[PDB]
């Protein structure tokens, strides 16, 4: 509860998960393998995400049941906003991994994946246009973790932490030389994007649950049946 906005940022930045590599083999071509590459990558990041969540200010103060609940709800959102962030300097491309750069044409390798691909690209283009900063990014990502499953005594504690992150975002924008009107506007723009990230996640859950029936790791199956 007691940390400077500068102390909030440095803590989040230091807690940032590493950028993992894919098992993508350029000698290889298929729909099954390309899906396997994404799901395997989206299984190893989860292990890091879980440990990242524990370093998010206020998350450790929650009960185990509440921690499990927030992660089960937001894990895909957190993965997606990370992907979108990594792909900022790569127009029209999604950087799943340093050795795995994909465009919307390669997203056509899987049925119904092109729709999710375009939405992720549009989100990445949005951050690029807004010139999203890393300090703002780690704030947004922590907001997702605490907000996505808060409705579905410890409630206002999360809200108090969320209010602190909002103050941090404003503190960052004020340091960039933005006027009060500009701070409020940029704050609104960033949070409206979270609505789109939620939408992409929901569609992602549908397409992923559909693939499970078609026939993924055990941990990823726990998240799906959640």
């Amino acid at each position: 509860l007691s940390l400077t906005a500068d102390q909030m940022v440095s803590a989040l930045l230091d807690a940032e998960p590493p950028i993992l590599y894919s098992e993508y083999d350029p000698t290889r071509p298929s729909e099954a393998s390309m899906m396997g590459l994404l799901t395997n990558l989206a299984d190893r990041e989860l292990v890091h995400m879980i440990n990242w969540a524990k370093r998010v200010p206020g998350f450790v103060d929650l009960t185990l049941h509440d921690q499990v609940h927030l992660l089960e709800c937001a894990w895909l959102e957190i993965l997606m906003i990370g992907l979108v962030w990594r792909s900022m300097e790569h127009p029209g491309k999604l950087l799943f991994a340093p050795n795995l750069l994909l465009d919307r044409n390669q997203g056509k390798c899987v049925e119904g994946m092109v729709e999710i691909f375009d939405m992720l690209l549009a989100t990445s283009s949005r951050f690029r246009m807004m010139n999203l900063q890393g300090e703002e990014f780690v704030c947004l990502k922590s907001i997702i973790l605490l907000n996505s499953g808060v409705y579905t005594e410890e409630k206002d504690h999360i809200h108090r932490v969320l209010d602190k992150i909002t103050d941090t975002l404003i503190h960052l924008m004020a340091k960039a030389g933005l006027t009060l009107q500009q701070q409020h506007q940029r704050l609104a723009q960033l949070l409206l994007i979270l609505s789109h990230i939620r939408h992409m996640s929901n569609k992602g859950m549908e397409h992923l649950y559909s693939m499970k029936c078609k026939n993924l790791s055990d941990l990823l199956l726990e998240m799906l049946d959640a």
């Binding site: 292990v47 879980i50 440990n51 524990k54 185990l64 921690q67 499990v68 992660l71 089960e72 055990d218 941990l219 726990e222 998240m223």
Partner: peptide, 9 residues
């Protein structure tokens, strides 16, 4: 409860 185990570790 793999998620619970990894959270406890």
């Amino acid at each position: 409860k793999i998620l619970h185990r990894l959270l406890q570790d």
